[PDB]
Design a protein around this ligand. Structure first.
Ligand SMILES: COc1cccc(OC)c1-c1cc(C(=O)N[C@]2(C(=O)O)[C@@H]3C[C@H]4C[C@H](C[C@@H]2C4)C3)nn1-c1ccnc2cc(Cl)ccc12
Ligand code: NA
Lengths: 60, 287
């Protein structure tokens, strides 16, 4: 369901997004810029599709 | 008569499904901390289906008068229904306690819930349930009723005002208090679940925890649906002292609440197979 372009689809929550070089987390802690509200940051993103589901990472 | 066959067929269907399912659940679980609580629930259900229902069918649905089980049986039957009522609610609240400790205090839980301490906490629950059901022993008896043909009946043997106190106290201890604790602990868990990225520090153990917590929450919702109407009926006896419409509404509400008492004893095994793939395979293997 998750699609990588910014991310859109059906996502309950997005967690760790980074350039695959640097990574950014929900809240902004970073290691080597993020807009948390916009759902925008190879790009790889950690996500969950429901409250009861397992953690997954998808590539773009 | 037509109503009697209709009610009797619904009870027989529940008895077959409930008996086989809870009996399998015991062996299936047999061959860890979660396992004991689900085992204890299966046992409360088996007593309800094997002892309470046969008395209800004979001396309530088919033969209204006279009572045939003697004075002792009259006292024993009401005592059993209360004892089962307490055991079920206490198990669901304690099962809710085990899930909460796993999510919000993982390291502390390991010692707090240990297999030896789990066996002891379940024993206390059964002992407590029987003690809470002792008052109904004294409230009910067998009396010879003169001249409604006269004869032996199972009826309350104390003042009707005092009887109301006994019913209200049971409602608070068996339903209201459990619901308040269960509501608070589940609210807390969901707030943690919606925030944390990983629980227990691995993906596999995180996925396992979320699936088990979801299963227990389904147990809770089924409990609220079956038991809350039953307490409302009991509360009508205390506070609702009629036309043809109102009479019929009260008659049917009473029969519906009676069927729900048995439905509660049969729902769990069905829920386990639907929610969990692993239980289904072992259960299907054992069954
Ligand atoms: C005044 O009571 C009600 C008024 C309106 C609706 C009612 O039930 C749907 C009730 C009600 C509750 C109980 C009700 O729960 N008795 C008990 C029971 O479980 O059998 C009896 C009496 C005590 C001790 C023990 C356990 C409790 C409470 C045996 N019984 N009961 C009824 C009493 C009298 N007439 C009724 C007529 C109709 Cl059409 C429907 C219900 C009636
Ligand atoms: Na039960």
């Amino acid at each position: 369901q998750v699609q990588l372009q910014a991310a859109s689809g059906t996502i309950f929550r997005l967690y760790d997004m980074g350039w695959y070089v640097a990574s950014i987390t929900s809240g902004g802690s970073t290691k080597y810029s993020r807009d948390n509200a916009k759902n925008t940051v190879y790009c790889n993103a950690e996500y969950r599709t429901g409250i009861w589901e397992e953690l997954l990472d998808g590539w773009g | 008569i037509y109503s009697k066959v209709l009610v009797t067929a619904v009870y027989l269907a529940l008895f077959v499904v409930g008996t086989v399912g809870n009996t399998v659940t015991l062996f299936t679980l047999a061959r860890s901390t979660v396992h004991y609580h689900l085992g204890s629930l299966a046992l409360s259900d088996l007593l309800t289906l094997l002892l309470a229902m046969p008395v209800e069918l004979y001396n309530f649905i088919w033969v209204h008068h006279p009572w045939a089980f003697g004075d002792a049986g009259c006292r024993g039957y009401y005592f059993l229904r209360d004892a089962c009522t307490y055991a079920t609610a206490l198990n669901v609240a304690s099962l809710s306690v085990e899930r909460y400790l796993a999510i919000c205090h993982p390291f502390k839980a390991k010692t707090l819930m240990s297999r030896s301490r789990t066996k002891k906490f379940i024993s206390a629950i059964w002992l407590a349930s029987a003690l809470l059901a002792v008052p109904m022993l004294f409230t009910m008896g067998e009396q010879n009723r003169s001249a409604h043909a006269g004869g032996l009946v199972c009826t309350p043997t104390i003042h009707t005002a005092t009887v109301k106190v006994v019913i209200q106290v049971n409602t608070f201890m068996s339903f209201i208090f459990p619901m308040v604790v269960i509501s608070v602990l589940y609210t807390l868990m969901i707030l943690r679940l919606k925030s944390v990225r990983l629980l227990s520090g691995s993906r596999e153990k995180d996925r396992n925890l979320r699936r088990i917590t979801r299963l227990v929450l389904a147990v809770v919702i089924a409990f609220v649906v079956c038991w809350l109407p039953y307490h409302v009926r009991r509360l009508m006896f205390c506070y609702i002292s009629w036309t043809p419409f109102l009479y019929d509404f009260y008659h049917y509400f009473y029969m519906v609440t009676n069927a729900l008492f048995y439905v509660s004893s049969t729902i769990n095994p069905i829920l386990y197979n639907l929610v969990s793939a692993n239980f289904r395979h072992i259960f299907l293997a054992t069954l």
